[PDB]
Design a protein around this ligand. Structure first.
Ligand SMILES: COCCNS(=O)(=O)c1ccc(Nc2nccc(-c3cnc(C)n3C(C)C)n2)cc1
Length: 276
């Protein structure tokens, strides 16, 4: 750590505190994360998971029983960018570009059997070049808003499909400028999903009733059309979103397959208006 100079406290919570810092030698600006063995080997395997849409992990510093992660620095997260776009919302071309890039990023980690497990606007970082990247991979006050239903129902060995679900929720949020399922407890989260997509059963989700936390007493809500869930979204988008929000993790579209959906027929890479 003697090689770094803390510039300011970026973010906080969860895995630790994050600071913007400068390398006392090179002057290189980075994101320094102070984390609060197995972890070591797992984190190291991450330094190899390099992709343009994955915030690059520069170094892993383990000293005095303390773990420091040095990352490539990005100037803003999606949360802040959405809040700054609330008045007019993010332009479709830019929403589509971000989704396309994240799917590319996911298709890559998934191919390497790595899942993020906690995708959310706060850990999606953007630059002035129009790129968006996945941050805070890894392996209270944490948002459950983007949690996949299988996790909520107690699935112990959930798949990469959970990242697809989270991304679908983020997609809907960019389009409507409002969180899709803002649960404030695990059961509320589950019930918000149920009220919108319908209480899942053996028909739409084989085996769902045999899940750890599934209760036969769950209220039975009927599904709602996506025309009502994300109105402005054209048919291609609504079609893709519905496949990203499928209950059956085995039926949920994969990232790679998602990249082939017609919604991306006219995908481009616009530049956002960032006021750093
Ligand atoms: C409460 O205040 C929120 C402010 N959000 S922000 O001002 O738009 C903002 C968020 C993140 C960053 N920079 C950043 N770059 C690389 C990795 C990283 C990183 C590495 N590990 C983590 C957890 N992160 C971030 C997601 C914090 N954070 C710069 C500015």
């Amino acid at each position: 750590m003697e090689n770094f100079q803390k510039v300011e406290k970026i973010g906080e919570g969860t895995y630790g505190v994050v600071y913007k810092a400068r390398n006392k030698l090179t002057g290189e600006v980075v994101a320094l994360k102070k984390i609060r063995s197995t972890a070591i080997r797992e984190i190291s395997l991450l330094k190899e998971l390099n992709h343009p849409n994955i915030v690059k992990l520069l170094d892993v510093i383990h000293t005095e029983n303390k773990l420091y992660l040095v990352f490539e620095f990005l100037h803003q997260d999606l949360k802040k960018f959405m809040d700054a776009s609330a008045l007019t919302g993010i332009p479709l071309p830019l929403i589509k570009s971000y989704l396309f890039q994240l799917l590319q990023g996911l298709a890559f980690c998934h191919s390497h059997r790595v899942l993020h497990r906690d995708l959310k606007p706060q850990n999606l970082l953007i630059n002035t070049e129009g790129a968006i990247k996945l941050a805070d991979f890894g392996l209270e006050v944490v948002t459950l808003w983007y949690r996949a239903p299988e996790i909520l129902l107690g699935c112990k060995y959930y798949s990469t499909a959970v990242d697809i679900w989270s991304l679908g929720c983020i997609f809907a949020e960019m389009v409507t400028r409002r969180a899709l399922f803002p649960g404030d407890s695990e059961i509320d989260q589950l019930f918000r999903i149920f009220r919108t997509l319908g209480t899942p059963d053996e028909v739409v989700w084989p085996g769902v009733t045999s899940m750890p936390d599934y209760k036969p007493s769950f209220p039975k809500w009927a599904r709602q059309d996506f025309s009502k869930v994300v109105p402005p979204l054209d048919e291609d988008g609504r079609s893709l979103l519905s496949q990203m929000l499928h209950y059956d993790p085995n039926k949920r579209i994969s990232a790679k397959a998602a990249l082939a959906h017609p919604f991306f027929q006219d995908v481009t890479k616009p530049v956002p208006h960032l006021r750093l």
